[PDB]
Amino acid sequence: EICGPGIDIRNDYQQLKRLENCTVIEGYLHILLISKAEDYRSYRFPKLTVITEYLLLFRVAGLESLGDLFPNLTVIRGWKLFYNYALVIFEMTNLKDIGLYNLRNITRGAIRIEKNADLCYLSTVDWSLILDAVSNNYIVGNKPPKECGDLCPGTMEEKPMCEKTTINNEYNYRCWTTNRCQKMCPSTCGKRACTENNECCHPECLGSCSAPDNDTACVACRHYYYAGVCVPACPPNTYRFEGWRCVDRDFCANILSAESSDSEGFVIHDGECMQECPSGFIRNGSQSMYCIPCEGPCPKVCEEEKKTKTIDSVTSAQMLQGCTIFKGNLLINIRRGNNIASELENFMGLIEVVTGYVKIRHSHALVSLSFLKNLRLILGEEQLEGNYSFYVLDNQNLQQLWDWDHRNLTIKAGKMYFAFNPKLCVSEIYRMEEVTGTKGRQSKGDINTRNNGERASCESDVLHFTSTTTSKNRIIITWHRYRPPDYRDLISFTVYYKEAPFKNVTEYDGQDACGSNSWNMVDVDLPPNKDVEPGILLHGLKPWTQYAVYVKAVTLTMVENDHIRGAKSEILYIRTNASVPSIPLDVLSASNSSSQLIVKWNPPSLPNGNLSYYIVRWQRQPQDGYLYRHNYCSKDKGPCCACPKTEAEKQAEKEEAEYRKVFENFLHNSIFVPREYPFFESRVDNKERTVISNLRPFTLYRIDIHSCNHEAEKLGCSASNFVFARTMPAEGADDIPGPVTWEPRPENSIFLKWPEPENPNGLILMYEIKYGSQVEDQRECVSRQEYRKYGGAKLNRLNPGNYTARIQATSLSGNGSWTDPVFFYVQAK
Amino acid sequence: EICGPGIDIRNDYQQLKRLENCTVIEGYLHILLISKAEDYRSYRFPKLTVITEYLLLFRVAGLESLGDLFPNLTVIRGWKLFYNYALVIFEMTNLKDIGLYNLRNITRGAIRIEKNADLCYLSTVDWSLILDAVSNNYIVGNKPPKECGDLCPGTMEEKPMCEKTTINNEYNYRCWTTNRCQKMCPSTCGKRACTENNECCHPECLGSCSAPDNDTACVACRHYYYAGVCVPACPPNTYRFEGWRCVDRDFCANILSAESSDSEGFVIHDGECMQECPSGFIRNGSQSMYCIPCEGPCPKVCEEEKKTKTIDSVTSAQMLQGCTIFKGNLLINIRRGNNIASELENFMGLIEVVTGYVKIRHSHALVSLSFLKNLRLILGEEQLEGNYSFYVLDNQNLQQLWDWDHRNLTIKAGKMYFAFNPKLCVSEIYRMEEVTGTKGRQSKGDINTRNNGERASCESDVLHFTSTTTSKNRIIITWHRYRPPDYRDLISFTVYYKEAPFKNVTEYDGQDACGSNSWNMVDVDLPPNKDVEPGILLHGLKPWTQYAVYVKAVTLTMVENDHIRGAKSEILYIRTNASVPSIPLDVLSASNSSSQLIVKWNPPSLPNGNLSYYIVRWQRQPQDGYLYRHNYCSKKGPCCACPKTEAEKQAEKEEAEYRKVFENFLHNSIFVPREYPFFESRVDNKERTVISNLRPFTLYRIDIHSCNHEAEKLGCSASNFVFARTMPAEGADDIPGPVTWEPRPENSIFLKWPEPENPNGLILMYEIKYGSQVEDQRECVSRQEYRKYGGAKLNRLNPGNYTARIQATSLSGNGSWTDPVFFYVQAK
């Protein structure tokens, strides 16, 4: 009586005649597009009790109340959701009552009940009792609440019979239709269910039951239904099916297929009989009782219902995402594209093996198939005419296949036929022959010395570098004077340069719209003097790298054609000290401890270089006499919520700013007629960090960070980029080192004298004398100069009596320690 | 004492020595970047009275009062503005009071006094009396208001001396500095001026004068100053110089230059001595007394300070926008660009002549130089080495220069050289020799059959179209079965197709990233059977365009290469009825008058056709009996609160596609294997027509077709349909005859009347209005009720006389009320 898989019904009522025996539809259910409205309440299915997956009702004409059609539908499990909902009521023509009065809970998903024509009573449904995470319930599009006439038994006239429940301060009746209420199981059950007239159900139960505390009496189980009993976990030797039941291996090979089905046969793993084994695991043959781990990324079969999965764009490769092996092939006909590779390395860069051919056709912007990294082997079962199991035709600007210095590839059951790729030189393919076990499998015309790399150029020689001068933003190099078979042939020398620090960059990574655009060319002609060799002076080269160099010539091929030799030199990697270095960046340092200072910086951005060694010059800086000569005792998707506009006139602003700047330039042109401490050095070795110690506790230090690199010797050092930092004051050095002395003076005056700190931190700015008779309220200031002149200070016109005093020093770092109590007295006479 | 042009000073006080004799600085003034702050109020310039243009002060250290430096500055004309503004005080280091106490008016532009550390006394400067359009002023960023200490004589302690003026409900004192107030001419003086002690000046005056109503006493008058006298208009034989004065033609020609100067010599136009004559007019030689109209676009010289304006991007084409003749030479080196042409037709499509070379170096994406349209002639004075005054090297994807069918191009003083165009067919250049008269000016190697079009390739033959089958949204075609010197050569036959109705299209408009990307290639090869000639069946055609197709031969070049012939067939234009037709769009109509109805529609987007003539079938429609059998008597946008822009739109796309495929498989497996005639009036060429001789108020059906050029052979297209109602017959709804009344028992009255002869649409009901004194009672009679009885009955009426009226309810609207019906009912 377990109907499955999910049932579909549309365009007629008679299709409901397939629901007499359905109690738990093991799947989803669709009752949709019933536009006839021919029949009425003659189809009744009390047997239906649960839908494992979501339910979809749509355009069901002639239907007024679902509860009549599908009663006893105790619970919807909703293991699979439509979008995220376990029930769909879309554009319901004439439903008045939601019904489902026996429906009690929804395990997974929300509901969409919108834009119906005559539905209400949704307000009377307290989904909180039925549904968890109800905030996703989407019922906005229905009738305004005013008109539908929310009433039902109890809340109309007759004695109330619906229970009273509260949501968000709404303690009122809950119900489903005009004929019945919405009861909920008492808190006496807690999470447990119950039956009519408040008889509470078994713990392992849900929806409803027939007898109190009986496993076999439950209408719907809570988690898993087996052997006519609801159980909390899957009994041993039995293995969970999808959703709501346990079951033993035998069928799990036997559930072969029925219309919509895959296996044939379901495998058991992790204690459950799933459709296919999870990731990182492999089904060993037709076994279904367990599943063994594979090892690597094997568990992904990329198969598609088609045979030749043809690709023509990035959007064409989305389906193949994160997949390794296909029972098929490739076919590209891209006729335009920018940054396409960076996408295809991601979508299908994981493809690893193919059972057939790999075909490339009429692709312009394809430059070098290095953008498909993981292909290792090709079987060739799915072959072309003539058993060509690896094809590339009319690939205009193709440059070269996957890197072949370290990577390997194999073709098992076929050959390859490259044609009409004038930029696919024969050197890249003469290596393919020896590697994929196909050297003699085919003839040479299949690897024709024609169109293959045709404009990939006769047979190029090498231009010999005569010398390599260099500079600090300006490479140089010179090379052999080119002498063709006929001197009139050659016309110039296109001189390449890009920044390839890492030797893994070949002459064909980025050339010009053929190989992409990375090697930013520039050219210069041979001098008219045949006695002066072709030598050039690049410039404008950003710092940091082997802005490499190599020489080809833009030459003339005709009449003799193949006899026209052309030339291409080797890929030299002139370096820095060719682009000789420069100055620092990002200078910083701090004082963690006294007589210590951590200095750190970063690899500077324009040192025209690569790391050799770093130097910082730190010099003690003066404590300015300006501070000494001052008496401080008396001295005293963003904001566009209110975006005004998006100025496409930024270009007009550009021109206006250019006009202003040029006006200021000519303005400048014509306004004026023709017009104590040593340096300490500690080179770092290779890092931009170092530490400085043996420093006075509270001295201000200047920190000259340099790019004194490998060529600091020849070309002198770089500039000295600088920063200054202070040290951490010596704790306890600010306290007064000696006792205070007091002497009497006339006019009831007292003179106070004391010593000065031996090692003040920075400088002593002032002294704060605190004194008084009973409480030291009086506070007066003494400057360092005032202290020097008198060795202290004077207090005049003090009242008779005894006194206690204290003194504090104000260091440049902060306040000092208070002096010990000073006891003195003044007599009236 | 008329210093000019504009004066500028910086970086030192000693440059202020250049203002002792300057009374009216005939230009702008810069006193900026004085960071020294060396001196103080020792430089005094009472003479300075007016600045013709804006005044800029910036970074003038050590200055606390501008009024001391530049007193008597009565008015600033501000003819030329800084940005839109006649005064800019930017980051004034220490200025305290603006001074300018003698300044009275600003003619053009506004002021910019912002972010000054120590500036004050702007709140008391009521710019309205000085300035027009005070709204744009911006003084938020300066010294904020709270401590500004805006006080001045009178408003502090002592007896008030500043006058009271009101702006936006603030009638209080105005002033300049702590020592002086803000005085202005009274309402007695009006727009017109005055001096101290309120002695009102002359009419043609401004700022200030010396004596009341005297031409020669004005300190700085209103509009124009000449011969020591102000005048309202520039006197005859004298010509207005820029801004504030007139000058005889002799001076207008004598002003050669002084450092910053253009003419050398100024020309006279419209009564004013201008730097250059305005647009559309030309200075005949060196004449300055007058300027004569030229004719066309001559008056715009494109000359640049540089000699070889090198072109490297669209941003490199802006400066020469809207320019016709360059006296130099131009170099394209764009290494990448999309839609660049469309831009350079506007930026540089107007250049016509050049006195020098045109050179193209290292341009990958340049495809056909047709986009530089206006270039007609090249003089060539500015030449390269070897007299190459028209040069092209390393244009990778060049296809074709300016269309040489109707376009002429000329070079006067040099030859031309083109190399490293692998895609420049020699047929594009062989005609150049005969157009610019340069056939012999250069050797054959100069326009060599070498590099020029090297992959413009060998030489193309032409195929024969054996037959041309065609279809209705889809093509077919065949051509001759070519036999090369060696059969193994050919590997496929290229099959282009685009939509080129206007026969002005060559194969090289947009081919593929070489010529741009327009001819959307797709290819099919020869069939295995040599007895079956190459045939093909394309698809994907958009309707209504005199379509385009052609073929070439894609060949293999080696061993002999040049002998590998290839081929190119003619650019055929398979057409409509080859792209056989389709069905209509955009049908509408309305009723302007009875028995008339205007019908209009649109030439469909899918006619697949040539306009030949349109057909409309209109049919009278029945009036539904449903209505008859019913008794009606009783019946920068939303982003002010923008939530987000879903970059997850791709994920939404996948979810939607998943749902659609789900529904597709769901559809697959749900079900196991399962009163009037037509009238026609063909339009001729337009999509409009009229239909007449129609019943006044009958609803019509309007079938509009694409029954077009070849509706003959393949029958008509679909018949796209709409309805439309006519205007009701005015006056046909009125009752045609009188009403009759009869007595009935129970004080009842029976009313009978005739029916409209030609009701408009249908008579739904009758509204009888009756009463004794006032016809208050209103009752309804249905059409069926009237038919059964010929009227209606009224029962239980009170005794007395009565008057009644009746109205009919037509489908178009209410009818006309009946004439008064007089009747009476007796109690017994």
**DSSP state letters, A549-575:** BEEEEE----TTGGG---BB---B---
Q: What is the largest CA-CA distance in chain A?
A: 132
C-beta atoms of B556 and A491 within 8 A? no
Preceding omega of A190 cis (within 30 degrees of 0): no
Beta-carbon contacts of residue A291 (< 8 Å; ≥ 6 apart): A267, A268, A269, A277, A281, A282, A283, A284
Degrees, nearest 5: CA angle A662-A665-A668: 155
Phi, psi of A744 (to 5 degrees): -80, 155
Partners of A705 in beta bridges: A616, A721
Partners of B587 in beta bridges: B601
Phi, psi of A725 (to 5 degrees): -140, 150
Partners of B237 in beta bridges: none
DSSP B120: B
Q: Using CB atoms, which residue from B336, B451, B517 is nearest to A556?
A: B451
Region of residue A156 (left: phi > 0; alpha: psi -120 to 50; beta: else): beta
How many C-beta atoms surround the C-beta of residue A596 within 10 A? Answer: 15
A703 touches A587 (CB < 8 A): yes
C-alpha pair distances (Å), A151 with each of A114, A129, A256, A584, B30: 20, 20, 51, 81, 85
B726 touches B700 (CB < 8 A): yes
Measured CA to CA, the distance from residue A726 to residue A722 in angstroms comes to 14
Q: Which CATH number fits domain B224-293: 3.40.50.150, 2.10.220.10, 3.40.50.880, 3.10.180.10?
A: 2.10.220.10
Number of C-alpha atoms within 13 angstroms, CB side, residue A425? 13
Residue that the structure tokens 């270089």 belong to: A609
C-beta atoms of A259 and B11 within 8 A? no
Beta-carbon contacts of residue A33 (< 8 Å; ≥ 6 apart): A10, A11, A58, A59, A60
From B566's Cα to the closest Cα of chain A, the distance in A is 14
Measured CA to CA, the distance from residue B221 to residue B209 in angstroms comes to 8
Phi, psi of A225 (to 5 degrees): -110, 120
Q: Which residues of A touch B336 (CB under 8 A)?
A: 513, 517
Measured CA to CA, the distance from residue A405 to residue A401 in angstroms comes to 11
- How buried is residue B483: exposed, middle or buried, by Cβ count under 10 Å (0-12/13-18/19+)? exposed
Dump strand ranges (E) for B287-344.
292-293, 308-311, 325-326, 329-332
From B318's Cα to the closest Cα of chain A, the distance in A is 9
From A421's Cα to the closest Cα of chain B, the distance in A is 11
Q: Which residues of A touch B659 (CB under 8 A)?
A: 83
Q: What is the CATH number of domain A308-447?
A: 3.80.20.20
C-beta atoms of A640 and B639 within 8 A? yes
Measured CA to CA, the distance from residue B69 to residue B76 in angstroms comes to 16
From B670's Cα to the closest Cα of chain A, the distance in A is 6
Resolution (A): 5.0
CA B792 vs. chain centroid, Å, equals: 69
Q: Using CB atoms, which residue from B8, B556, B645 is nearest to A637?
A: B645
Task: Report which of A309, A315, A300, A350 is spatially closest to residue A328, judged by C-alpha positions.
Answer: A309
C-alpha pair distances (Å), B224 with each of A642, B191, B218, B219, B500: 48, 16, 12, 13, 63
- Please name the residue of chain A whose CA is at the shortest distance from the CA of residue B516: A336
C-beta atoms of A512 and B455 within 8 A? no
From B700's Cα to the closest Cα of chain A, the distance in A is 31
Measured CA to CA, the distance from residue A789 to residue A772 in angstroms comes to 25
Q: Find the length of chain B.
A: 828
Measured CA to CA, the distance from residue B745 to residue B827 in angstroms comes to 10
Q: Which residues of B touch A364 (CB under 8 A)?
A: 512-513
Number of C-alpha atoms within 13 angstroms, CB side, residue A429? 26
CA A441 vs. chain centroid, Å, equals: 47
Measured CA to CA, the distance from residue A701 to residue A736 in angstroms comes to 26
Q: Which CATH superfamily is domain A465-563 in?
A: Immunoglobulins (2.60.40.10)
- How buried is residue A256: exposed, middle or buried, by Cβ count under 10 Å (0-12/13-18/19+)? exposed
B819 touches B738 (CB < 8 A): yes
C-beta atoms of B562 and A558 within 8 A? yes
CA B683 vs. chain centroid, Å, equals: 36
Q: Which residues of A touch B558 (CB under 8 A)?
A: 448-450, 454, 562
Q: How many A×B Cβ pairs under 8 Å?
A: 100
Measured CA to CA, the distance from residue B433 to residue A797 in angstroms comes to 116
- Please name the residue of chain A whose CA is at the shortest distance from the CA of residue B335: A512
B217 touches B228 (CB < 8 A): no
Q: Which residues of B touch A554 (CB under 8 A)?
A: 394, 420
Measured CA to CA, the distance from residue A792 to residue A758 in angstroms comes to 16
The residue type at B356: G
A786 touches A757 (CB < 8 A): no
Residue that the structure tokens 């997949």 belong to: A323
From A109's Cα to the closest Cα of chain B, the distance in A is 17
Phi, psi of B212 (to 5 degrees): -70, 130
- Please name the residue of chain A whose CA is at the shortest distance from the CA of residue B522: A362
C-beta atoms of B671 and A11 within 8 A? yes
From A268's Cα to the closest Cα of chain B, the distance in A is 27
B578 touches B468 (CB < 8 A): yes
Q: Which residues of A touch B660 (CB under 8 A)?
A: none
DSSP for B544-581?
SS--EEEEEEE---STTGGG---EE-------TTTB--
Q: Using CB atoms, which residue from A365, A420, A646 is nearest to B636?
A: A646
Q: Which residues of A touch B556 (CB under 8 A)?
A: 448, 450-451
- Please name the residue of chain A whose CA is at the shortest distance from the CA of residue B662: A82
What is the distance in angstroms between the CA of the first residue and the CA of the last residue of chain A?
122
From B614's Cα to the closest Cα of chain A, the distance in A is 39
Q: Which residues of A touch B417 (CB under 8 A)?
A: none
A269 touches A248 (CB < 8 A): no
C-beta atoms of A671 and B419 within 8 A? no
Q: What is the CATH number of domain A7-220?
A: 3.80.20.20
Q: For strand B548-554 and strand B567-568, is the pairing parallel, antiparallel, or unpaired?
A: antiparallel
From A640's Cα to the closest Cα of chain B, the distance in A is 6
C-beta atoms of A362 and B558 within 8 A? no
Number of C-alpha atoms within 13 angstroms, CB side, residue B300? 13
C-beta atoms of B513 and A365 within 8 A? yes
Q: Using CB atoms, which residue from B362, B558, B642 is nearest to A450?
A: B558
B391 touches B416 (CB < 8 A): yes
Phi, psi of B281 (to 5 degrees): -125, 160
Same fold, A224-293 and A308-447: no
Measured CA to CA, the distance from residue A337 to residue A349 in angstroms comes to 18
Experimentally, the structure was elucidated by cryo-EM
Measured CA to CA, the distance from residue B539 to residue B475 in angstroms comes to 6
Phi, psi of A200 (to 5 degrees): -80, 145
- Please name the residue of chain A whose CA is at the shortest distance from the CA of residue B31: A671
Which of A512, A526, A665 has the highest number of chain B CBs within 10 A, making it the mutation to test binding with B?
A: A512
Beta-carbon contacts of residue A605 (< 8 Å; ≥ 6 apart): A543, A544, A585
C-beta atoms of A667 and B8 within 8 A? yes
Beta-carbon contacts of residue A592 (< 8 Å; ≥ 6 apart): A598, A728
Q: Which residues of B touch A450 (CB under 8 A)?
A: 556-559
CA B254 vs. chain centroid, Å, equals: 45
How many C-beta atoms surround the C-beta of residue B489 within 10 A? Answer: 20
From A21's Cα to the closest Cα of chain B, the distance in A is 19
Residue that the structure tokens 């004589």 belong to: B153
Q: What is the 3-state secondary structure (H, E, C) of A430-475?
A: HHHHHHCCCCCCCCCHHHCCCCCCCCCCCCCECCCEEECCCECCCC
C-beta atoms of B394 and A554 within 8 A? yes
Which of A556, A659, A660 has the highest number of chain B CBs within 10 A, making it the mutation to test binding with B?
A: A556
From B567's Cα to the closest Cα of chain A, the distance in A is 17
For residue B688, the surrounding DSSP H or E stretch is strand B688-692
From A559's Cα to the closest Cα of chain B, the distance in A is 8
Partners of A294 in beta bridges: none
Q: Using CB atoms, which residue from A11, A335, A558 is nearest to B517?
A: A335
Measured CA to CA, the distance from residue A284 to residue A293 in angstroms comes to 9
The residue type at B677: P
Partners of B444 in beta bridges: none
Q: Which residues of A touch B360 (CB under 8 A)?
A: none
- Please name the residue of chain B whose CA is at the shortest distance from the CA of residue A258: B669
Degrees, nearest 5: CA angle B434-B440-B442: 110
- Please name the residue of chain B whose CA is at the shortest distance from the CA of residue A647: B636
Q: Using CB atoms, which residue from A8, A455, A637 is nearest to B670?
A: A8
C-beta atoms of A364 and B420 within 8 A? no
Beta strands across the sheet bearing A588-590: A588-590, A596-600, A689-693
C-beta atoms of A559 and B666 within 8 A? no
Structure tokens that stand for B616 in this block: 């409309």
Beta strands across the sheet bearing A522-524: A522-524, A492-496, A550-554
